[PDB]
Design a protein around this ligand. Structure first.
Ligand code: CLA
Ligand code: CLA
Ligand code: CLA
Ligand code: CLA
Ligand code: CLA
Ligand code: CLA
Ligand code: CLA
Ligand code: CLA
Ligand code: CLA
Ligand SMILES: CCCCCCCCCCCCCCCC(=O)OC[C@H](COP(=O)(O)OC[C@@H](O)CO)OC(=O)CCCCCCCCCCCCCCC
Lengths: 29, 742, 41, 141, 159, 62, 80, 90, 34
């Protein structure tokens, strides 16, 4: 990630994955 | 009123009760069904108040057991004297006490252990002792092995005598309860007779034999040319050659003109400049004063001669507003219960042992004692451990009394009742102060460690950074330093050299004592000492107070003093008795005393001891690195444990090899304790069944069924092994260090 | 005298007598046959 | 039998203690024990300390049930005194517990039902591996 | 002066005592006249007073002994740390009020005096009462920290 | 059930004395007793007792 | 809330009820052992888990068994 | 002389308030009015927790980001040369 | 490190704020009777 936009891409992808994990946890409870 | 009371021949001496192993208690006199009989036999072998119920037989048994203990102590002392006579380099030590290491034990050459007989000097080969018996004999005036032999025999005689008495007063003439209860005459005779006359006799021995012999030893004469201790008794002129006051006869003492006895009855502080010890001309005066003090103090209590106090009118007279009905009903407690006396006696004797250990290192009373560092360290550590054990014993016996001797039908006397009635406050406040002390003592060390780890030492609690100089101890030191000029005009010098005043004293190289500084590193460790002592008091006092009942178990006194737990109910009630509180307090006593002895060792090697050279330059052993390196736990890890532990580990193949072996042996015993401390009875009892199966398969099933140790014996074994391992490790480490580097 | 023999027939006394006799035996053997690592038979 | 009814009998003489009631007694249950004595003795309190009970009737309120039973057993054994104790709710609803039918639970009595009695030997219960996904445990059967 | 120790309210079967520390004219007066024990006054005013006192006292152990106690920003860092501590305590008070108080319960406070007078319970043990207390405490703490900083590192009269 | 003074071996699976022998003391001959046989053993259990009662169909080996 | 059980081996020793410090166990008429007595646990809502009951029954294994279940205020032995 | 009752149940359970000042007003009415109009909106706990969390977040953000070089030690970075590896590494 | 201003933004937002809010949420969820 020697570039600058790539960090933002990683951040937004981590956020999407977090929302997915949130939905899964809600379904598990 | 007060008279002799004896019951002629109350117990026929025979061997009948001797063949039946269990005989004292009827519950286990029947026989060993299971193997938990061999254990509780030895457990309640000395539970005199549990076998029977009448105070008379209990008191007689206690008396005879005391006599047996005295006989054993006499055998021990006679053995030490005989060893100093037969297998010691004492006479060679006397000719050069600064280059000859003491030694009074030799080892048979059998399996290569011959190398334990190290080269101690004087043409001798044996283990180097640290009991300090050589210094004691030099201070007593003993100057020949013959004078030891005799006294050895003497001890042996007393041993037999004691044994005889022990038999007599139980089998031929045993007293009755009404005789032991005369505490007034007992205290009268222990004050005036035992302490007073004993101190007077020792002052006589000092002033007659110990002063001239030791003075001639200080003048540099050969210990063989010194006249015998009776040439100063049958020749007042030969003794007056040193202290001419003896030429005045016994007249000054009787005409109250005894201010002319200032030759041998002196008042001079400091230490003898050549032996590094107190002036015997001062200890003679001290004993002479203590003797008359105890003698005139032995006339206080009333006997059948009309006059004197009675320790019941004295008690009831003290009854204030805040404290209910005063000390009423305590004279009935301490004359109808042996435990309430053992508690006080053990507490006072332990505290006194601690006082002794603190006094002797600071005012060395024997010649060439402050020079030999090994002896001065062992005499501190041993006595500290003894006191620490005795105080916990006091707590345990107070708990026992509260459990099975206390009764309220007479204890409406609101002194013990009142302290029993706010235990939930006493323990709460003690808990809070323990927490406060623990934080404000150990969190400071953690702060210093984190700062010195984060590369920011300027934020530490050192003596360069934020300071915590103890001002009160410094003021006390400065006050005692100036006492011989304002508050003690007749004393020539301060009582000790540890006070800031005075100067250094040398004993031919190594230093004896000097003024001790006090900085932040001492503030922290003193607060740590206070914290650990407070936690120990917390545990023991909680046990003692809740020995009878609590919110959890309101009928605990029915269960008894020693019992594992009241079921797994109420969430859990494991370790709820007073015995378990003593079990828990033993570990904290161990912690406290270990911290104290570490403190003393490091501080002495760093800021007191050393070897001075000409022109005055003095270099301590470690190099004064205690003020700066003892403020962080890492400093105690490397600069004390890792650094000083470098002598014992590499002692293999040398005369100090047994210490290197016992290091690892004690480590093994300590780690072995954890098997009992962590596990529980059920697992082992189950495992034993699978071994009994293999035994039955081959017809080797024993008739005494192998049950596992009880829940309380597991704890006892665990704490015993833990204490043994820890103390023996510290023993080996301390000795292997100080013997080589001191 | 019979009860004295019974007492001498106890477990600790027989244990210490046996172990002391065995210690004496082994100590004498090692004082006469020292440094035995290999059986010369 | 008609359970005895509470009253306003006096209380034993006691100088106080720090092992008494707590907030549990005003937001939840608490207990009170009574008895009858022929003289004035000194009895040990189950909360620490001693107290002098009074002649005739006495009434004492405590914080648990085990305290009342401990004190009552001590009474019945040492002083030969019979007793009862109740449980009181925040709203003042007294409930009579210990001598539920007059006779103490040791001596047998008619008109008593058996509860928790299984008609088999303890070593006969089925394994806990057949009654899975079925909340019958092993022994309620 | 005869016997100064007494059970609580003369009832031996409660867990405590009327020692000179707990029960005493001077002590009872000093303890009743504290804002947290003044019952009828509105919770917001008590919270304001208490927060003022605490925020004003807190600036000390933060400025004299900090990580920046040897810089030109000596007092500012300590004042900021004090403000941080008071907002953290406000958050803890808020979550305590949420977890411990309901919006329908009348009052958990005691209602009687020392002599059984049927007085009224303290409104502080209500949900909205604790909310007002928390708001007033937040405001008082911030204002007290600010005033302490003003008096110390803006004006004269060193200590 | 069995005779008095008879040596019988236990079969109760949850007994400390399982597969062990013991001599009967006195079997009660009431009509409705569920465990009438009384047997005393020469080795106590974990609790310390040595006497116990069984049903006649629960122990017999002679 | 613990579960007490009394299996049909009680010889009517009456020790279980004498030992229980909560008035939980009581005697009951039940013919069959010797004296038409048996134990009964109607007040299991007060047992703390003391297991003093099981430490008293001199039966082969046991006849009164306590099973620790859901914890409450009464069973925890709390006074605060 | 009796210490029990079912009517006055609060007398026999220790529910008294040992320190109760029933004073309805202690401060100046003007000062109270000027204190409640400014510390009144802070009463809404639902709109105060979500205010405190955002305030603290933004505060430790701005102070964590817009720091000073002299103040912090991890922000001033290294101003020296690095030591070398014990095995000839870097 | 490209950004080099993100470590000053995130660890204050992950070691201080994140626990501060999740502990409060979990304490509200624990101490509630529904
Ligand atoms: C002369 C020989 C003699 C004889 C035949 C007896 C005979 C008897 N004594 Mg007796 N006694 C004697 C000498 C003698 N005593 C002496 C000299 C003393 C003074 C110490 C006593 C003090 C004494 C007391 C206080 C009691 C008896 C009791 C008894 C009776 C039962 C003793 C028994 O079974 O325990 C046998 C016990 C042993 C074999 C243990 C011996 C251990 C010794 C004493 C200590 C050794 C310590 C040693 C240094 C080891 C330390 C640790 C080591 C491992 C490193 C019995 C009639 C008891 C009695 O009648 O009560 C009903 C009783 O309570 N005796
Ligand atoms: C607590 C007292 C005490 C202790 C610990 C010892 C311990 C010891 N003694 Mg000893 N001894 C004692 C009292 C004591 N004695 C008394 C009172 C006397 C006088 C009767 C003697 C007379 C004595 C002799 C004559 C010898 C020992 C020897 C020994 C050592 C070997 C003993 C052995 O293996 O058997 C051992 C270190 C032997 C030894 O050290 O051999 C070199 C040896 O020869 N002892
Ligand atoms: C704190 C020290 C102290 C105190 C306060 C007392 C106080 C007392 N002693 Mg006393 N005494 C003491 C130490 C003390 N003693 C010592 C150390 C000895 C030894 C004695 C030996 C002694 C005797 C022999 C007598 C007193 C008596 C008395 C009482 C009458 C004396 C008087 O007031 O005139 C008085 C209560 C007399 C008395 O009748 O007391 C009850 C009495 O006959 N005392
Ligand atoms: C003046 C000293 C003194 C006296 C007279 C007593 C007397 C008594 N104590 Mg006591 N005690 C003392 C000091 C003393 N204690 C101290 C200092 C402590 C603190 C540790 C205790 C802690 C204590 C407890 C916790 C208990 C007693 C109990 C008892 C009673 C029965 C003791 C018994 O049968 O032991 C028999 C002796 C043994 C079983 C010996 C055990 C072996 C020891 C633990 C190991 C020794 C190690 C040794 C030094 C070296 C090991 C290596 C070597 C063995 C190879 C008896 C009245 C018990 C009781 O119920 O009181 C009524 C009890 O439960 N005491
Ligand atoms: C090293 C091991 C260890 C430690 C740390 C403790 C600690 C403690 N024991 Mg203890 N104990 C131990 C071993 C230990 N024990 C063992 C082995 C035994 C068996 C014998 C016992 C037996 C025992 C008894 C019987 C008693 C204690 C008591 C105590 C407490 C004394 C109060 C005190 O000083 O608080 C000070 C606490 C500390 C110094 C702990 C360190 C705290 C650090 C410095 C602060 C950290 C800052 C912050 C909070 C960290 C946040 C982290 C977060 C950001 C993630 C304390 C909690 C007593 C008690 O309960 O009194 C209250 C008591 O009665 N213990
Ligand atoms: C240095 C400490 C130490 C030592 C020497 C031992 C020694 C032993 N343990 Mg042990 N143990 C220890 C610490 C120690 N334990 C600790 C700290 C625990 C944790 C509680 C255990 C838990 C443990 C269990 C659970 C078992 C042993 C067993 C054994 C035995 C294995 C047989 C053997 O090696 O000989 C032996 C006596 C076993 C045994 O009984 O052997 C048959 C066994 O089952 N130990
Ligand atoms: C299973 C363990 C084990 C085994 C197989 C041996 C075996 C041996 N040991 Mg040994 N020893 C052991 C444990 C063991 N030891 C332990 C635990 C210790 C410490 C107490 C010793 C201490 C010891 C000594 C001090 C000596 C031996 C000696 C010997 C040798 C016996 C020569 C003889 O008397 O004939 C033999 C090789 C002797 C020898 O000559 O070794 C060659 C000898 O002098 N051992
Ligand atoms: C180590 C703790 C510590 C430190 C460094 C200070 C430091 C200071 N306090 Mg302070 N204070 C403290 C604890 C501390 N306080 C505590 C525990 C209280 C009790 C609530 C107070 C109550 C207090 C008052 C009431 C005042 C100070 C004031 C002051 C300042 C001048 C003195 C100074 C900054 C004074 C101040 O800053 O006034 C402008 C002032 O008026 N302090
Ligand atoms: C599990 C994987 C993991 C771990 C342990 C770490 C650990 C760390 N990261 Mg990080 N990071 C990761 C994945 C991970 N990262 C990913 C995938 C990305 C790309 C989006 C980043 C982007 C990132 C940046 C931009 C920064 C860090 C920083 C840091 C450090 C400070 C903590 C912090 O601010 O985190 C903040 C974390 C994030 C902003 C995103 C989290 C990434 C994923 C979604 C978390 C994984 C969830 C995890 C598995 C569940 C844990 C469950 C557990 C609680 C039981 C710390 C060493 C900081 C640093 O270097 O300080 C020196 C910093 O500035 N990280
Ligand atoms: C220190 C206090 C002190 O001076 O005690 C003085 C006071 C003793 O006063 P009295 O005059 O009641 O007591 C004298 C005699 O009655 C015996 O104590 O002790 C108490 O009030 C209890 C101490 C608890 C201390 C709490 C800490």
């Amino acid at each position: 990630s020697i570039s600058d936009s790539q960090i933002i891409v990683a951040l937004v992808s981590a956020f999407i994955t977090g929302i997915l994990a949130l939905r899964l946890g809600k379904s598990l409870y | 009123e007060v008279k002799i009371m004896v019951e002629k021949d109350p117990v026929k001496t025979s061997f009948e009760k001797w063949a039946k192993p269990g005989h004292f208690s009827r519950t286990l006199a029947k026989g060993p069904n299971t193997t938990t009989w061999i254990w509780n036999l030895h457990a309640d072998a000395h539970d005199f108040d549990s076998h029977t119920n009448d105070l008379e037989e209990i008191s007689r048994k206690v008396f005879s057991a005391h006599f047996g203990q005295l006989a054993v102590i006499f055998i021990w002392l006679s053995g030490m004297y005989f060893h100093g006579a037969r297998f010691s380099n004492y006479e060679a030590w006397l000719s050069d006490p600064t280059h000859i290491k003491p030694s009074a034990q030799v080892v048979w050459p059998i399996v290569g252990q011959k190398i334990l007989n190290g080269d101690v000097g004087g043409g001798f080969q044996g283990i180097q002792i640290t009991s300090g018996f050589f210094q004691l004999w030099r201070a007593s005036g003993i100057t020949s092995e013959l004078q030891l032999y005799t006294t050895a025999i003497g001890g042996l005689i007393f041993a037999a005598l004691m044994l005889f008495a022990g038999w007599f007063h139980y089998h031929k003439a045993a007293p009755k309860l009404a005789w032991f209860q005369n505490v007034e005459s007992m205290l009268n005779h222990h004050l005036a007779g035992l302490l007073g006359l004993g101190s007077l006799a020792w002052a006589g021995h000092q002033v007659h034999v110990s002063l001239p012999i030791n003075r001639l030893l200080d003048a540099g004469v050969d210990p063989k040319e010194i006249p015998l201790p009776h040439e100063f008794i049958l020749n007042r002129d030969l003794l007056a050659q040193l202290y001419p006051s003896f030429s005045k006869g016994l007249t000054p003492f009787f005409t109250l003109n005894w201010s002319e006895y200032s030759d041998f009855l002196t008042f001079r502080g400091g230490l003898n400049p050549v032996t590094g010890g107190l002036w015997l001309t001062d200890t003679a005066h001290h004993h002479l004063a203590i003797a008359v003090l105890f003698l005139v103090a032995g006339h206080m209590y009333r006997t059948n001669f009309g006059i004197g106090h009675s320790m019941k009118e004295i008690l009831e007279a003290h009854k204030g507003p805040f404290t209910g009905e005063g000390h009423k009903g305590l004279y009935e407690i301490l004359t109808t219960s042996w435990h309430a006396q053992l508690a006080i006696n053990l507490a006072m004797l332990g505290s006194l042992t601690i006082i002794v250990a603190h006094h002797m290192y600071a005012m060395p009373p024997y010649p060439y004692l402050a020079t030999d560092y090994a002896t001065q360290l062992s005499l501190f550590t041993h006595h500290m451990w003894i006191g620490g054990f005795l105080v916990v014993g006091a707590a345990a016996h107070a708990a026992i009394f509260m459990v099975r001797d206390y009764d309220p039908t007479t204890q409406y006397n609101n002194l013990l009742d009142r302290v029993l009635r706010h235990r939930d406050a006493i323990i709460s406040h003690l808990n809070w102060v323990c927490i406060f002390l623990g934080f404000h003592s150990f969190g400071l060390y953690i702060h210093n460690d984190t700062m010195s780890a984060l590369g920011r030492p300027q934020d530490m609690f050192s003596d360069t950074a934020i300071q915590l100089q103890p001002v009160f101890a410094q003021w006390i030191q400065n006050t005692h330093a100036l006492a011989p000029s304002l508050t003690a005009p007749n004393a020539t010098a301060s009582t000790s050299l540890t006070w800031g005043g005075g100067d250094l004293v040398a004993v031919g190289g190594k230093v004896a004592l000097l003024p001790i500084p006090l900085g932040t590193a001492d503030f922290l460790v003193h607060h740590i000492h206070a914290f650990t002592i407070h936690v120990t008091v917390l545990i023991l006092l909680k046990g003692v107070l809740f020995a009878r009942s609590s919110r959890l178990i309101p009928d605990k006194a029915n269960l008894g003093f020693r019992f594992p737990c009241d079921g797994p109910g109420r969430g859990g009630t494991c370790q709820v008795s007073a015995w378990d509180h003593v079990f828990l307090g033993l570990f904290w006593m161990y912690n406290a005393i270990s911290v104290v002895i570490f403190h003393f060792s490091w501080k002495m090697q760093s800021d007191v001891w050393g070897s001075i050279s000409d022109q005055g330059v003095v270099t301590h052993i470690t190099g004064g690195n205690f003020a700066q390196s003892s403020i962080t736990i890492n400093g105690w890890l490397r600069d004390f444990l890792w650094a000083q532990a470098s002598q014992v580990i590499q002692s293999y193949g040398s005369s100090l090899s047994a210490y290197g072996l016992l290091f690892l042996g004690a480590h093994f015993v300590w780690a072995f304790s954890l098997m009992f401390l962590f596990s529980g009875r059920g697992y082992w009892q189950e495992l034993i069944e699978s071994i009994v199966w293999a035994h039955n398969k081959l017809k080797v099933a024993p008739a005494i069924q192998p049950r596992a140790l009880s829940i309380v014996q597991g704890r006892a074994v665990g704490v015993a092994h833990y204490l043994l391992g820890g103390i023996a490790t510290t023993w080996a480490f301390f000795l292997a260090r100080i013997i080589s580097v001191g | 005298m019979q009860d004295v023999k019974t007492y001498l027939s106890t477990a600790p006394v027989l244990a210490t007598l046996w172990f002391g006799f065995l210690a004496g035996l082994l100590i004498e053997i090692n004082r006469f046959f020292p440094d035995a690592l290999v059986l010369p038979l | 039998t008609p359970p005895t009814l509470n009253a306003d009998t006096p209380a034993p003489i006691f100088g106080g203690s720090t092992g008494g009631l707590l907030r549990k007694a005003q937001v939840e249950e608490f207990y009170v024990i009574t008895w009858e004595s022929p003289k004035e003795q000194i009895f040990e309190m189950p909360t620490g300390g001693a107290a002098i009970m009074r002649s005739g009737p006495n009434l004492l309120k405590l914080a648990r049930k085990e305290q009342c039973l401990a004190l009552g057993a001590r009474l019945r054994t040492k002083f030969k005194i019979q007793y009862q104790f109740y449980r009181v709710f925040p709203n003042g609803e007294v409930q009579y517990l210990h001598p539920k039918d007059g006779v103490y639970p040791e001596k047998v009595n008619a008109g008593r039902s058996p509860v928790g009695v299984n008609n088999r030997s303890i070593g006969k219960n089925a394994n806990p591996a057949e009654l899975k996904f079925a909340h019958k445990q092993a022994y309620d059967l | 002066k005869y016997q100064v120790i007494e059970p609580l309210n003369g009832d031996p079967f409660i867990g405590g005592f009327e020692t000179p520390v707990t029960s005493s004219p001077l002590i009872a007066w000093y303890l009743s006249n504290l804002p947290a024990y003044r019952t009828a006054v509105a919770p917001l005013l008590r919270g304001v007073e208490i927060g003022l006192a605490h925020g004003y006292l807190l600036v000390g152990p933060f400025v004299l002994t900090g990580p920046l106690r040897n810089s030109a920003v000596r007092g500012e860092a300590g004042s900021l740390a004090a403000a941080g501590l008071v907002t953290i305590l406000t958050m803890c008070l808020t979550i305590y009020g949420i977890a411990s108080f309901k919006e329908g319960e009348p009052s958990k406070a005691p209602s009687l005096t020392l002599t059984g007078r049927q007085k009224d319970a303290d409104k502080l043990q209500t949900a909205e009462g604790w909310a007002s207390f928390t708001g007033g405490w937040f405001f008082g703490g911030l204002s007290g920290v600010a005033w302490a900083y003003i008096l110390l590192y803006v004006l004269n009269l060193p200590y | 059930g069995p005779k008095r003074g008879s040596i019988v071996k236990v079969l109760r699976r949850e007994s400390y004395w399982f597969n062990d022998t013991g001599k009967v003391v006195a079997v009660d001959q009431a009509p409705g007793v569920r465990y009438p046989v009384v047997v005393r053993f020469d080795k106590v259990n974990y609790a310390g007792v040595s006497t116990n009662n069984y049903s006649p169909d629960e122990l017999e080996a002679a | 809330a613990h579960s007490v059980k009394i299996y049909d081996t009680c010889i009517g020793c009456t020790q279980c009820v004498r030992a229980c410090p909560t008035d939980v166990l009581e005697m009951v008429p039940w013919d069959g052992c010797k004296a038409s007595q048996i134990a009964s646990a109607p007040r299991t809502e007060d047992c703390v888990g003391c297991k003093r009951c099981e430490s008293a029954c001199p039966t082969d294994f046991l006849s009164v068994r306590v099973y620790l279940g859901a914890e409450t205020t009464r069973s925890m032995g709390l006074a605060y | 002389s009796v210490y029990f009752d079912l009517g006055e149940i609060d007398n026999t359970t220790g529910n008294w308030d040992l320190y109760g000042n029933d004073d309805p007003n202690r401060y100046n009415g003007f000062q109270n009015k000027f204190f409640e109009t400014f510390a009144g909106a802070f009463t809404k706990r639902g709109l105060l927790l979500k205010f405190l969390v955002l305030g603290g977040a933004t505060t430790i953000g701005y102070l964590g980001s817009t720091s000073s070089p002299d103040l912090l030690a991890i922000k001033n970075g290294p101003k020296q040369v690095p030591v070398m590896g014990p095995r000839g590494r870097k | 490190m490209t950004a080099s201003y993100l470590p000053s933004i995130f660890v204050p937002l992950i070691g201080l704020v994140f626990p501060a809010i999740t502990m409060a949420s979990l304490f509200i969820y624990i101490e509630q009777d529904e």
